[PDB]
Amino acid sequence: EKKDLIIRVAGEGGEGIISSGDFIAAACARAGLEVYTFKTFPAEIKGGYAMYQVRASSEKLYCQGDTFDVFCAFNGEAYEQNKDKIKPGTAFVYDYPGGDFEPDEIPEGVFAYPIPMSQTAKEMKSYRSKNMVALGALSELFNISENTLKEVLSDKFGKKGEEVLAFNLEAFDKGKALAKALTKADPFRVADPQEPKDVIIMAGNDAVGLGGILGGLEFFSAYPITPATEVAKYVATHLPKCGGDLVQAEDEIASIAQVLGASYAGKKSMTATSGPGLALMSEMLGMAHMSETPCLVVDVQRGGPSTGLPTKHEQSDLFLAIHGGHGDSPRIVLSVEDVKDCISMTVDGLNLAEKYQAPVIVLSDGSLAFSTQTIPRPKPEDFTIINRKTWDGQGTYKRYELTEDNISPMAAPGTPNAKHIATGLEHGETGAPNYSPANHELMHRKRFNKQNSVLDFYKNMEVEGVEGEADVGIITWGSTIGVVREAMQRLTAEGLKVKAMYPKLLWPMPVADYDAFGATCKKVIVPEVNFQGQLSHFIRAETSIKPIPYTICGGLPFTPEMIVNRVKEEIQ
């Protein structure tokens, strides 16, 4: 049985393609449904082809899906761009007649529903309301809750007047009549309204900004870069309310430098950037490792290399996150999967930075940045907050004192009798420069054993599927994880002996836990959106698994059918 419906709407930006997608999401959310959206803006700021795809279901959603079930074209270019995907069995709504095109030979089996969208908008002497007519048409044909749909438009258009709201509502049911006038033959219906669960809708980047605030953020320093600038916008808006500060530095080096300055002063600090920014922060992240200063860097991964594809999808910064520092300069690297992790794991990042006095890197991606989801409404007391180990005042203070857990207690400025230095030079217990052989071996073992000890406290590598021996094991990271969840729903439903593992702690990696997984797997498939198979590289180097890399690098994420098809070939 099909419980979800995938609706893709496309057209010229400015005709309300993005807003119409958000309204459908809010309507299904008010009706107690799970929503998973994904949008693309036009490739140029001046205008062009915009695309929004909303997925509503009665059960949990984990990715975008294989392809759309319902497509809605506002003009001819939207049709030609998606013509390859308008396959038999799918519903097709388009702007006809009155539009700027007549559809080609519609393949036999395609449920076509021509709706004069531009005509009814022109008949009302207001082309601005073209997107409202499609909302009424899609609400009728595929059972979108009209009461919640008109409520979302009321909350948005009520502040302009009573005649502004009543006019757009008239365009809605005008398209509702054009729709119900046609013969509904498609088997596609949005699940019926359930009890509205206590949830919220949030985009991934906004979730990172919230996760920082809920995690005790006090200082944020940013420099704009696509697709991570949104995080600074959320933090610049809301963090000043909570007594914190955001500063827009002159570049990424200055931004991460300011983070260390505020972290040495005792404040929880972080920054957000993308690929090119992380590569500029490499030298300062090594300083963070050497001086043992806590700091958080969220890298919303975009396409590379170099300037690359700033707006496309790619998870290719794992080589840089782990080996990006000169000398032996390790980092704590995490990678989120959904909007949920963008809040919890940004909290976890600040905590692990506080707990281990080390640079922490949180890997996101460009899709997850803009994708909006329905997540359980968060409460500030739901999250564990960790703070840096503070000196008890007893004895004589040493900033880099050798302890049993290698974590030297910290002291913010102003603490009496705790004057110390944080330094980038190799040093002794008091922070003084020390070039001796035995001290370098001693301090490397202090800082490495300290950071490696995260494996004894942070465990985020879920396993689902069959419990016994499996024909094929699947290991993936990032937002590809959610794609493999839905792929595992289908593979297990056919009774295949497959299991999956979803690492979210990337470095250091629990080598022993990897071997425990790959021991019960005849073959291991590692799907990731990067050219070199970067996670597969660290699996061959550190564990005993010999994996099978399933690598794509075209600026697009995986779909569940791609994963399912790849597994069945290796089952044999």
Add this chain to the structure above:
Amino acid sequence: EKKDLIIRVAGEGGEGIISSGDFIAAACARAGLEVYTFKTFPAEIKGGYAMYQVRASSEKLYCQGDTFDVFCAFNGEAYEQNKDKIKPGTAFVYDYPGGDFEPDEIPEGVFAYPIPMSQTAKEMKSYRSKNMVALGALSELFNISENTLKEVLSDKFGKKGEEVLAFNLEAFDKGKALAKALTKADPFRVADPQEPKDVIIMAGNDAVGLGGILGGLEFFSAYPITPATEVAKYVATHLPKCGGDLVQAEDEIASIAQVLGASYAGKKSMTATSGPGLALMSEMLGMAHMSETPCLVVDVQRGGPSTGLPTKHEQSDLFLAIHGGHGDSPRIVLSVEDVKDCISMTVDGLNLAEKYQAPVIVLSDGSLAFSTQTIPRPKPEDFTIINRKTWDGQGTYKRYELTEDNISPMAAPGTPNAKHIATGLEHGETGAPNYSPANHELMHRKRFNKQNSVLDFYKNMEVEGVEGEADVGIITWGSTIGVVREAMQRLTAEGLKVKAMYPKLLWPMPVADYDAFGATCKKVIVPEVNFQGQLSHFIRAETSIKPIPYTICGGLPFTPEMIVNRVKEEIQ
């Protein structure tokens, strides 16, 4: 049979310890001997423990040796640092009386020669000439060609004044009488001057500058960093003679930025830096890979992480050289071994950059940077020179045209009918921005297959040792190679079943040749001076060898006895 002599001179920096060592090395070369020096000093200009060790032999040398035969202490700290190595059978010259220390109970059998060095310096009203009285004293005791010694110190100290030179010449023959007047009981004498074979003496960094010049360098941009500043000094001095230019940029980012700018203009360009600088160059090196612009970066590795140990010895930039770029951004990584490689492999770097239009990184280290060696006299026509593939003018030009070898012909500005763009954005054949999926896959395969084809053209991984099956195999890179060479002379002379392999092409790595080696080895030992065992990481990831990492991270290189002792442990 012992053919070599090791003379170590130590003292407080600023007392001329390094200058005295260079004179002894130059004197042994005039006597037709092979020389291998090694120096260590503190990161501070005028104080700390300074050490110079010169090695003269009648056969080829490959490292500094296990320990000294003759030791000379200028002060008390020099004595205590080497006291454990002042074992019976060694000669001992020290500053007494009048120094700042009195040596403890000198063990029976140690040929002690107390020389009042600091006393005579105060007697001449010039403490700067303190090291010359020790220089004159050492010349007598061990038959250093005294005639050449006054010539080399005159050329270096003639630019200081006429009264400073007359004082240093007075200290030489003052110490000359104190030494041979004493009863010579040591069995250590430098061989009498023979005909000097056709060689030259050169420091590692100075040799890198020469190899670049001989390889057709036209533009050099540098920013000072220890221990890489010397390369800029040699290049600034001599490259203007050969029609080239050197510019000191404002930072390492500007430095590598200018290199690409001059290389896009059509000239062979390069730069030299160290750990912190390479980490600052990470973003621009990615631009070089994406735009397919040739450029060379010589990274003289120092101690890390962060500011680290700027003057010590370490090969810890392998993680940064290969994975230092965001996205999939590979580099061609080489690693030199001796002063010979500092010329030949710097030519190879410029050649491999020109031939494959890619960023090339040549890794050196701090010891080899300052070590001076005797190498055969080079001739400019001895070296193969490769130039970038230039457009023939036929047809319509495309900067990133797809060809059979993936190498698009280049065209310097001014070339008619060849107006083009070099870009960091993902692009098509003509350089225009192209974000389509199939093009990203196509261009990733173009640039990777291009750079990966170096394995089909450049092979620098010598293998020596036993011909059949071996009990233990040794794989190492950098200047550790020469240390393992001397270790292999001792292991093979006793008839042990061991073989060694010396990779000098590090990335991309010839996986097939590595597996061919590891097939004939029961155990494989990878000695390297870095904390994480960085080459061992790339050995486990890309090859089938399961190596044994022998990792030290104390700012000191290996010695042959350390390798030999480690080998015999794994044999049985």
Add this chain to the structure above:
Amino acid sequence: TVEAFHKMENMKPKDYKSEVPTTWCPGCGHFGILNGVYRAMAELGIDSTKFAAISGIGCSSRMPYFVDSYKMHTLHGRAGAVATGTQVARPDLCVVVAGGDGDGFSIGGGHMPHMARKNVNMTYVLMDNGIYGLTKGQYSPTSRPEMTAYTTPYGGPENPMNPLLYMLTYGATYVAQAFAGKPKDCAELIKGAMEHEGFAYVNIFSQCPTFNKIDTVDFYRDLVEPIPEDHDTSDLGAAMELARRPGGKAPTGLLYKTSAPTLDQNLAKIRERLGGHVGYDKNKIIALAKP
């Protein structure tokens, strides 16, 4: 000596347009600057084969794509650095740098002083829209404090910097300012910037109607105040006063112009004093390493 000037006869502005159509928003002030770049190349008869246009990252930095010449699209804020390597290696080329205010005085602010100090013979056309355009509307080092933008919803917590004053202090040997709404003012000042042998800086106000809602055409139209002709373009002190905007009005015209050695010339003297040339006997250099 630049060898790209006066090599082509009877050239029109449209002769330097490339096959790439423009991507800018309708009304964007960068169009005025681009058309001024065309007219300047045409009035000089430039053989664009000996013309190099190097840009960083930003809406302003997409201009080289629209120019028919040799061109480079590098990283954010490093164009002037990369262009320096080009200009030194090939002093014959006409080198021009194009970029925005954020590209130039934010991430690229470290390379600005050394370009003008060393007096590299190149032209810097900075298109000042007072905002970060391509990243969708964050405030810039030239943004006014009262403006509310992407990452500054509650106003700008600092004052703007003076681009003309920076370059005059840094020692630029040709400083001019223009408005994009006067495309023949841009073309003339850009023309003299290219002919000038030295580092020529041209600050041009370019409206961004999509994201900057207060620095509009009407605002820039009133902000300008043309420099009087009796102004002395050799008086650095008088030019710095004009740069400091007397009476709140920004100057347009030529502020400062002077002749001084360029970087490639001083680098050449080093080679000339050594008798250096391409066919030097490299064995002479190797001979110095003999024992």
Add this chain to the structure above:
Amino acid sequence: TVEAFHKMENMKPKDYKSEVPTTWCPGCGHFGILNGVYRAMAELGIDSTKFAAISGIGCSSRMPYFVDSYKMHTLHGRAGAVATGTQVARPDLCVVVAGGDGDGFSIGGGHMPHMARKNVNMTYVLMDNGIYGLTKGQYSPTSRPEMTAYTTPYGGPENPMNPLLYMLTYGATYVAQAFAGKPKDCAELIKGAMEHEGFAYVNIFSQCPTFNKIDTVDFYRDLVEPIPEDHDTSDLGAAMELARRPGGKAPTGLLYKTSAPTLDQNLAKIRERLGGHVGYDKNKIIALAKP
């Protein structure tokens, strides 16, 4: 509001010495500047627990190790950047930045203008020796052209930059210059720099006898020329003329001083207008995400 001034009574310079012995060469001018920092801290009765000394990379940057206070030894050219994060996070501390001429106006020249522009309440003590000391004598942005140095055996192919003129143009609200051989000039100007609320820059000539052979003590003593007291320290134009060295002589004293809002104050106004505080009910922020 800085809470570290006038908190300790009967303080001597030696109370601010740390357990770390000095590493500088005998005769180096950095000893005078360190001694000027000591006397300045003593005359203010500074509780050094609320004192932050942050440095970059270089001989000059080794100074924090020798001061008994909270301190940081950061990366090359990033001291002023790291210090800004320190000052903003804890506006109560007295923040001081120490570093060399190469550290500040070469790799760190990108962070210089924004420090002074945003008027961060901190003091910048720049030790100007006209050379790269710790890396053994390469010329710097302040080296004179005729000097022959490590990477410039045939002279400098560019002119030096003006540190006072740069900071005046960038908009620093306290600009002074001193000589290391006048340890009571250093102590006074550093004292007024710390009490000043704003970005205070103090350019201090410091000889380097080990590597710099022409910028000697005798040279610096003849180069200086103390500012007359009738000079108006509120006249920016007069201070810029003083910085440009009338008659070839470099000024010593107070050049420019003015009161203007600091970065942490403007950051505070943003929180004040919002009624922001640590105990904000964060659930209001999450409520905006309800569908």
